[PDB]
RNA sequence: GAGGCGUCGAAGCCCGGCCUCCGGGUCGGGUGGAGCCGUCCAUGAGACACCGCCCACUCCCCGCUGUGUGGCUAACCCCC
RNA sequence: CACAGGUCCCAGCUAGCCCGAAAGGGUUUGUACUGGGGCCGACGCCUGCCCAGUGCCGGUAUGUGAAGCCCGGGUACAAC
RNA sequence: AGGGGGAACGCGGGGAAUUGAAACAUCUUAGUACCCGCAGGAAAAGAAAGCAAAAGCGAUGCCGUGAGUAGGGGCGAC
RNA sequence: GGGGCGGUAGCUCAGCCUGGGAGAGCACCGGACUGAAGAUCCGGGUGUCGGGGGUUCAAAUCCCCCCCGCCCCACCA
């Protein structure tokens, strides 16, 4: 669960191992914005298909872990392959 | 003529939901045109040339319908206007050959989108509007 | 599901739920053709008749315009009475005058709702309204309900009580005699109970005894759901 | 204000003009509203120094403790180089009649002395930036001597919604003080803040010169 | 920024309104008639020295603008 | 099942309620002694106790509560 | 000067559902069936605030082709 | 994951914009009082006040990072 605040691991950008700083992946709202949003303009009377939101859970105790690992040497984030399922993640010092 | 759209029968059918709309189903036939048909009906022989909006009170709309005597030589001799002589011009208002009809039927477009209103609406099987 | 119910049929104009209008011979107006004001008009009690359609006493009054119209009868009436109309009528039992000329504390009937329509309130046999308070702004009258309504003093009304009473609601005795009253009116009778009429016919009941839904019903509910206690604010009388 | 209004905009040349019968030779004031003023980015916060291109017009008192070759360098530039003896006088007693605190504006130290400077002179000289604090320069003999003698003007931020750094007193030509006003503006705007009009308003005002709002 | 303001009339004396944590400041009348100040720097934070813009609670004339409410009828509408 | 009898409920008539696509219409040649809806079922003796839940009804400080409107940001305009 | 009729066709409105999706509601059936008004021997469209291979063209129908191509759509069937 | 409100002495909390060592009642303990039954007095303190840091002159609450409870909202980016 605990993971260090800074930790040395591989950076593809600079193509070398270096220290990365951890924060959480942050995701956008809707309501402009997208081609899927424009798909929800057929909910005028579109009660059966896609824009009615197909009303059903079931909806899963877990999530996986998704955690930006941020480069110090160029300031660009990366997200990558992980599989740490977590229900009580804590970020701590390091 | 009254304001608003069409006020429609209410069904006894057991239909599908999304066909039950009454106010969420709207006309394509214009009110200006309706005004003509009331006028043309009232006096059996006097025939609608065109019509225009003469203003409105915001509760009702008013239109003035121009009617002409289908037989009366005066119109017929002077060629500035003489479009009443032909048979077609008798019963022109119902089919939509007037000002109000032409504009409502989407003969107003002639460039882009003119694909299903050309030559006519029910030449394409009602894909037009 | 279910179909139109018992009230919903009445509004249609259905003939089981329509009054007869040819064994009826009623209505009362004070002649609003000459407005509330004007003394121009007097009449003579021509007869005291039974009105068949209101099953009530009525008086026939013969006007000096030469017109025959009914005025709702007072107590103590006797043929050959003079009824006068206009503000120049004396204040007397069975005479008709505007509210302003009428002093407070006196029994009154047949008051106009809106000035010049010959009455819209208090036209029932044996029932009478009492003039409690009077202001030239507005004249407050106490209704058969007990509710004080404000009226404009240009309205006409007549002095006295209305004749009869104890004769517009007395014991029905048996089914035969009860039946004779419902032909004189229009009420759907005999009517069974909803509780063992099906859940198709009526929202409540089944085949067995048991209700289906509670009697007192929402006021904002649609038509065809006004059953039970309709627009009730409270129910019952004991814990 | 003696003259003009503070919602009409002028140039920086014609915002300062010499015209005083007063004993006082017009003290110049620069005052600025910040729009999106914060203290959770250091780039909203305006605590810094700016070196004016013709100086204040009165000298900044710098007292310096330096040790090593930096002590000599500091002397060359035209300085006494005072001892750390003075930290003990300041700290020990709340005396008056000879106290040399309440008479300094800045301090420089070489790095081991700095913790003592903080605690002792901070007590007396305090807020209104008469104590030394690390954010405006107070370490390094080299550059900070050169700026203090060049009559650098000191700045610190009253949160909500104003910052003021009055450039100095008029002891020079009208244009020289317009060049001064430009430097102060360029430091504020160069720090990047949010939205439009990060300098909501700028005003140039005085004891008995024009008192005017200017562009910004 | 340790000085600034005035004989166009100022402290300091005598009262009125005054608020308040009675801390002390504001303020209209007048006697007056030419000083009171800060420096020292006590004070965690310094000067009604003087010059600027401001932040608390809050109050008021004027300019702009909504809604709520009462009168009017000219629209419009319900009654006969 | 009806039934006489009993109870509870709402409404001042430019009403309540309800019918009609609309124009309009029933109750109503009615006016609270009215007429509309449920519940129970002559007569005699009675109808205990509970509003926690569900329903109805009135009120609602505080909280919350859409579009319209308003303000700030954005956009050379607009989306946002 | 008119009602009304006329084998279908034509113009303008009003406008379903079984069915398909192995069920089912968007979608599909279909602008179909069905209904109302109305003209002719063709009807109607029709002499440019057009096209847009930026180049070339200048009223309008229809047939062949462009093509099951662009695009739509439980992105599923269609 | 977004918003708001309350977690404070053993308990429930007051002030939170009204800032400091600083609160309040009620349990509980001690004392009168009483043949008994019974009623009523008089004392006591337990949280810089949920955690950790900063601005401030002396901030519990302001700022920055949050645990716990509750109400209204939210997977495939």
Closest Cα in chain A to B19: A45
The structure tokens 């899927």 sit at A36
Q: Of A73, A89, A84, which is closest to residue A23 (Cα–Cα)?
A: A89
Q: Are A30 and A37 in contact (CB under 8 A)?
A: yes
Distances (CA, A) of B114 to B99, B119, B122: 19, 9, 14
3-class SS letters over B21-65? CCCCCCCCCCHHHHHHHHHHHHCCCCEEEEEEEEEECCCEEEEEE
Using CA atoms, how far apart are residues C61 and C41, in angstroms rounded to an integer? Answer: 12
The alpha carbon of residue A38 and the mean position of all alpha carbons in its chain are separated, in whole angstroms, by 23
What residues of chain A have any CB closer than 8 angstroms to a CB in chain B? Answer: 45, 47
C-alpha distance from B18 to closest chain A C-alpha (Å): 6
Largest CA distance in chain D: 55
Using CA atoms, how far apart are residues C56 and C76, in angstroms rounded to an integer? Answer: 15
Distances (CA, A) of C118 to C36, C128, D36, D165, D208: 9, 16, 75, 89, 89
Which chains sit next to A, with 3 or more Cβ pairs under 8 A? B
Residues from chain B that touch A47, judged by Cβ atoms under 8 A, are 17-18
Helices D85-92 and D114-125 cross at an angle (nearest 10°) of: 40
C114 CA to E73 C1' distance (Å): 20
Q: Of D142, D134, D73, D77, which is closest to residue D106 (Cα–Cα)?
A: D134
Q: Is D47 exposed, middle or buried (0-12, 13-18, 19+ CB in 10 A)?
A: middle
Using CA atoms, how far apart are residues D12 and D212, in angstroms rounded to an integer? Answer: 10
**3-state SS, residue B70:** coil
CB contact under 8 A, B21 and A47: no
Closest Cα in chain A to B16: A47
Neighbour tally for B92: CB within 10 Å: 19
Q: Are B3 and B60 in contact (CB under 8 A)?
A: yes
C-alpha distance from A45 to closest chain B C-alpha (Å): 6
User: Which residues partner with C130 through β-bridges?
Assistant: C107, C142
Reading the block at residue D61, the tokens are: 């008192």
3-class SS letters over chain C? CCCCCHHHHHHHCCHHHCCCCCCCCCCCCCCHHHCCCCCCEEEEEEEEEEECCCCEEEEEEEECCCCEEEECCECCCCCCCEEEECCCCCCCECCEEECCCCCCCCEEECECCCCCCCCCECCCCCCCEEEEECCCCCEEEECCCCCEEEECCCCEEEECCECCCCCCCCCCCCHHHHHHHHHHCCCCCCCCCCCCCCCCCCCCCCCCCCCCCCCCECCCCCCCCCCCCECCCCCCCCC
Residue B106 backbone zone (phi > 0: left; psi -120 to 50: alpha; other: beta):
left
Residues from chain A that touch B17, judged by Cβ atoms under 8 A, are 47
Reading the block at residue C203, the tokens are: 């929202």
Experimental method: cryo-EM
B112 CA to G50 C1' distance (Å): 9
Of chain C, the end-to-end C-alpha distance in Å amounts to 37
Phi, psi dihedral angles at B114 (to 5 degrees) = -80, 90
The structure tokens 């000289």 sit at D125
Resolution for this experimental structure (Å)? 9.0
C222 CA to F27 C1' distance (Å): 20
Reading the block at residue D127, the tokens are: 């807020």
Q: Is D168 exposed, middle or buried (0-12, 13-18, 19+ CB in 10 A)?
A: buried
Helices D142-149 and D69-76 cross at an angle (nearest 10°) of: 20
The structure tokens 């059953």 sit at C227
Reading the block at residue D161, the tokens are: 């919604």
Angle at B48 between CA B43 and CA B53, to 5 degrees: 110
Rg, chain A, Cα only: 19
């Amino acid at each position: 669960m605990k993971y260090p605040k800074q930790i040395r691991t591989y950076c593809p950008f600079c193509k070398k191992h270096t220290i990365h700083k951890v924060e959480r992946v942050k995701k956008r709202p809707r309501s402009e914005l997208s081609a899927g949003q424009r798909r929800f303009r057929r909910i005028l009377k579109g009660y059966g298909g896609f824009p009615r939101p197909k009303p059903e859970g079931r909806e899963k105790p877990v999530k996986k872990l998704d955690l930006r690992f941020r480069c110090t040497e160029c300031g660009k984030a990366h997200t990558r392959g992980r599989g740490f399922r977590v229900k009580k993640f804590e970020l701590v010092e390091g | 003529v009254r304001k608003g759209g069409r006020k429609r029968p209410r069904w006894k059918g057991g239909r599908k939901p999304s066909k039950m709309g009454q106010v969420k189903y709207s006309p394509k036939k214009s009110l200006q045109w309706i005004a003509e048909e009331k006028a043309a009906r009232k006096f059996p022989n006097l025939e609608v040339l065109n019509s225009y909006w003469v203003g409105e009170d915001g509760m009702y709309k008013w239109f003035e319908v121009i009617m002409v005597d289908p037989h009366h030589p005066v119109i017929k001799s002077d060629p500035k206007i003489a479009w009443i002589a032909l048979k077609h011009h008798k019963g022109r208002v119902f089919r939509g050959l007037t000002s109000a009809g032409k504009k409502g039927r989407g003969l107003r477009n002639k460039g882009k989108g003119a694909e299903k209103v050309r030559p006519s609406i029910r030449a394409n099987e009602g894909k037009g509007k | 599901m279910g179909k139109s119910l018992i009230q919903q049929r009445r509004g249609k104009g259905s003939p089981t739920f329509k009054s007869p209008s040819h064994r009826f011979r009623g209505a009362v107006k004070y002649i609003p053709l000459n407005y509330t004001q004007e003394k121009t008009l007097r009449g003579v009690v021509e007869e005291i008749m039974h009105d068949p359609g209101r099953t009530a006493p009525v008086a026939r009054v013969k006007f000096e315009n030469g017109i025959e119209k009914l005025i709702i009868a007072p107590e103590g009436l006797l043929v050959g009475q003079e009824i006068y109309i206009g503000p120049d009528a004396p204040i007397a039992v069975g005479n008709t005058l505007p509210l302003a000329k009428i002093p407070e504390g006196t029994y009154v009937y047949n008051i106009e709702g809106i000035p010049g329509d010959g009455g819209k309130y208090v036209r029932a046999g044996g029932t009478y309204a009492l003039v409690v308070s009077r202001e030239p702004d507005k004249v407050i009258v106490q209704l058969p309900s007990g509710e004080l309504k404000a009226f404009n003093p240009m309205c006409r009304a007549t002095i006295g009580v209305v004749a009869g009473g104890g004769r517009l609601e007395k014991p029905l005795v048996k089914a035969g005699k009860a039946y004779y009253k419902y032909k004189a009116r229009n009420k759907f009778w005999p009517t069974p109970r909803g509780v063992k009429m099906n859940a198709v016919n009526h929202p409540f009941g089944g085949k067995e005894h048991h209700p289906g839904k509670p009697t007192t019903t929402s006021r904002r509910a649609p038509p065809g759901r006004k059953v039970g206690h309709i627009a009730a604010r409270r129910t019952g009388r004991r814990k | 204000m003696p003259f003009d209004r503070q919602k009409i905009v002028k140039a920086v040349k014609e915002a300062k003009a010499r015209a005083k019968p007063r004993n006082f030779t017009q003290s110049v004031e620069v005052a600025v509203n910040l729009k999106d003023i914060d203290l959770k980015r250091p780039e909203n916060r305006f605590k810094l120094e700016v070196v004016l291109p013709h100086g204040r017009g009165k000298d900044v008192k710098i007292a310096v403790i330096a040790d090593g070759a930096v002590a000599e360098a500091a002397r060359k530039l035209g300085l006494d180089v005072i001892s750390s003896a003075e930290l003990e006088e300041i700290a020990s007693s709340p005396r008056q009649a000879r106290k040399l605190a309440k008479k300094y504006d800045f301090f420089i130290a070489e790095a081991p002395l700095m913790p003592k400077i903080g605690r002792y002179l901070g007590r007396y000289l305090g807020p209104r930036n008469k104590m030394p604090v690390v954010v405006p320069p107070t370490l390094t003999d080299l550059t900070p001597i050169v700026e203090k003698l060049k009559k650098t003007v000191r700045i610190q931020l009253k949160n909500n919604p104003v910052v003021h750094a009055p450039v100095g007193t008029e002891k020079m030509s009208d244009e020289e003080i317009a060049e001064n006003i430009e430097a102060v503006l360029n430091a504020i705007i160069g720090k990047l803040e949010r939205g439009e009009s990060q300098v909501k308003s700028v005003y140039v005002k005085t004891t008995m010169g024009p008192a005017v709002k200017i562009e910004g």
